[PDB]
Amino acid sequence: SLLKKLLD
Amino acid sequence: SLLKKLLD
Amino acid sequence: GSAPYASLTEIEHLVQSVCKSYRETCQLRLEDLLRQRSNIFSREEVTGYQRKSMWEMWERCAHHLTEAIQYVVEFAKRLSGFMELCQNDQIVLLKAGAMEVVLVRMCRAYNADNRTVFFEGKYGGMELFRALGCSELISSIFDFSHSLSALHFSEDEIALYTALVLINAHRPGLQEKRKVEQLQYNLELAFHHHLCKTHRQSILAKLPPKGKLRSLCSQHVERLQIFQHLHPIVVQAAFPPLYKELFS
Amino acid sequence: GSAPYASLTEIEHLVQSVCKSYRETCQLRLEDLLRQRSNIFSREEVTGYQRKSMWEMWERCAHHLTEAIQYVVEFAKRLSGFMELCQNDQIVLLKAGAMEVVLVRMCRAYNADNRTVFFEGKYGGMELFRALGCSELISSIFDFSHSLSALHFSEDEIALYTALVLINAHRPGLQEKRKVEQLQYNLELAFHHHLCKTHRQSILAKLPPKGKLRSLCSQHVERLQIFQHLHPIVVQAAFPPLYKELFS
Ligand SMILES: CC(C)CN(Cc1ccc(F)cc1)S(=O)(=O)c1ccc(NC2CCN(S(C)(=O)=O)CC2)nc1
Ligand SMILES: CC(C)CN(Cc1ccc(F)cc1)S(=O)(=O)c1ccc(NC2CCN(S(C)(=O)=O)CC2)nc1
Numbered sequence: 001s002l003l004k005k006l007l008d
Numbered sequence: 009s010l011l012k013k014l015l016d
Numbered sequence: 017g018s019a020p021y022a023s024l025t026e027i028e029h030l031v032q033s034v035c036k037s038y039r040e041t042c043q044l045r046l047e048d049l050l051r052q053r054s055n056i057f058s059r060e061e062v063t064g065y066q067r068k069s070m071w072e073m074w075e076r077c078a079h080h081l082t083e084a085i086q087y088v089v090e091f092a093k094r095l096s097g098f099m100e101l102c103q104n105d106q107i108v109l110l111k112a113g114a115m116e117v118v119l120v121r122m123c124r125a126y127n128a129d130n131r132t133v134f135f136e137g138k139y140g141g142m143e144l145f146r147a148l149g150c151s152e153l154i155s156s157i158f159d160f161s162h163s164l165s166a167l168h169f170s171e172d173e174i175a176l177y178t179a180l181v182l183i184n185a186h187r188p189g190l191q192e193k194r195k196v197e198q199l200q201y202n203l204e205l206a207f208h209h210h211l212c213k214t215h216r217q218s219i220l221a222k223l224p225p226k227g228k229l230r231s232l233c234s235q236h237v238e239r240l241q242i243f244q245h246l247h248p249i250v251v252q253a254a255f256p257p258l259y260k261e262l263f264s
Numbered sequence: 265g266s267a268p269y270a271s272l273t274e275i276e277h278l279v280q281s282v283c284k285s286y287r288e289t290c291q292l293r294l295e296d297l298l299r300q301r302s303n304i305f306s307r308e309e310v311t312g313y314q315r316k317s318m319w320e321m322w323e324r325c326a327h328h329l330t331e332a333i334q335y336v337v338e339f340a341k342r343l344s345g346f347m348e349l350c351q352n353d354q355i356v357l358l359k360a361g362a363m364e365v366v367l368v369r370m371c372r373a374y375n376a377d378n379r380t381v382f383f384e385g386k387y388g389g390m391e392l393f394r395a396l397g398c399s400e401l402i403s404s405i406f407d408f409s410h411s412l413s414a415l416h417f418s419e420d421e422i423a424l425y426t427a428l429v430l431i432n433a434h435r436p437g438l439q440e441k442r443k444v445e446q447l448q449y450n451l452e453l454a455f456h457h458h459l460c461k462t463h464r465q466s467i468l469a470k471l472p473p474k475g476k477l478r479s480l481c482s483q484h485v486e487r488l489q490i491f492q493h494l495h496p497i498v499v500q501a502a503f504p505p506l507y508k509e510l511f512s
Contacts, residue, residue, distance in 0.1 A: 001107065002257055002258045003107050003258070004107060007106050011354075011355045011358055011359060012351065014334075015337075015347075016351070197269065201269050204272075205453075212457065213460060217272075220272070
């Protein structure tokens with residue numbers, strides 16, 4: 001997901 | 009003990 | 017604040033940590049917002065916004081919401097103990113909480129003196145948003161901002177309050193719930209310590225009720241869904257992917 | 265209360281509870297102690313105390329300590345969460361803490377202006393106690409009382425501080441340390457909330473250092489053993505059994 005990608 | 013007797 | 021039995025020194029340090037994280041991710045400085053209050057949309061500009069297609073106005077608002085969310089994500093990433101959480105819980109908290117934090121932050125950009133909000137460089141009333149076709153929602157958001165402006169938050173109060181809007185151990189889908197509870201509790205101690213020191217504990221009773229923020233978010237998703245069925249191509253073609261992911 | 269994640273309301277409730285428990289078990293009325301300050305043993309009365317035999321003076325003092333200790337036992341039994349601790353740990357806390365709490369409460373009966381203490385109906389200096397044959401310990405207790413007097417504690421502050429002197433999760437011999445840790449933390453939160461509200465958080469750095477109460481108590485036990493070896497029968501025949509239990 002995009003939220004996931006923004007977090008790591 | 010006396011503390012026990014005072015406590016219960 | 018993941019560690020139990022936080023000392024007074026640790027609670028004091030957490031207050032400062034949270035305020036610093038907020039300051040560094042607050043998007044617009046309050047000074048700039050207040051300075052620009054004299055920058056208002058002209059009658060012609062308002063007419064122009066009202067003339068806009070529904071799709072163009074929604075697209076603009078979606079972009080601005082996405083920008084504001086991106087700063088809330090950065091706030092979370094800097095927030096004490098958040099990146100210590102597992103990825104699943106980080107995602108659960110932001111998915112549920114990011115829009116809620118944006119709605120709280122927006123009271124900064126609200127001017128009770130003329131009932132306007134900062135939008136695209138200038139201040140305008142709720143009539144600015146007529147082309148969206150969701151006037152009831154827009155009015156509810158203005159009312160919510162007005163109710164928060166009435167609390168007269170300091171920037172530090174906003175930092176501590178929004179940390180708790182985000183770190184909510186009750187959100188469904190958390191895996192390491194105990195870790196989040198511990199984190200929430202420590203942030204609550206921080207919030208309350210700061211309020212105690214500044215004689216502002218009286219504001220706790222006046223904070224938004226349980227379910228008010230949730231309702232606003234639910235209504236946003238509902239109105240987006242109405243728009244998306246009127247204009248199904250524009251969202252996939254032009255809206256920010258993160259916006260579609262969070263709200264579609 | 266031993267319950268985790270105590271809310272602000274629960275913390276406020278605990279402040280009131282601890283203060284109530286203290287008020288009901290504080291032994292002498294503070295107003296009486298303060299108004300009797302101008303009643304001071306005469307030279308002949310001090311001389312009378314100094315001519316008393318070592319055994320009679322120890323016997324009187326053991327009786328006065330035991331009386332004070334009995335009020336501290338009652339305080340413990342009324343103190344939120346204490347009776348919910350297992351009995352072994354109740355006994356460990358009182359056996360170690362009862363004298364510490366008495367030493368703290370005693371600052372109420374100490375006049376820093378003329379370095380006297382309330383004893384058997386009037387105020388006298390440390391020379392009143394010469395017949396005990398432990399002049400260094402007596403001087404150290406006067407110094408301790410003076411160090412506390414300088415903080416000019418309110419009665420509510422004494423309630424909350426003595427609660428923490430008693431509920432000390434570091435006492436060796438606790439079998440359920442975790443429960444004492446939780447009760448201690450909640451009482452810390454109550455103490456700190458009250459101090460923050462009343463602009464008195466400054467006293468935390470001035471409280472007796474680690475080891476000081478321990479030292480006074482260890483010396484009491486040692487001086488008692490010195491006396492007892494010189495006068496074994498007096499203790500068996502005449503001293504309070506609870507005193508013998510706690511300190512022999
Ligand atoms: C402000 C609302 C009356 C309208 N908006 C939010 C909105 C729009 C449609 C909807 F179905 C639901 C919510 S908006 O999209 O116009 C909007 C979005 C972001 C934004 N941010 C600005 C004000 C707040 N700050 S801040 C965080 O620095 O205080 C940044 C700029 N302003 C308006
Ligand atoms: C100031 C100390 C010298 C008082 N002595 C305590 C003592 C005696 C021998 C010893 F090895 C160690 C400690 S004492 O026994 O004389 C004594 C004991 C109790 C007591 N209590 C009174 C003062 C405090 N209050 S209070 C609790 O109401 O504030 C009760 C009456 N006063 C003196």
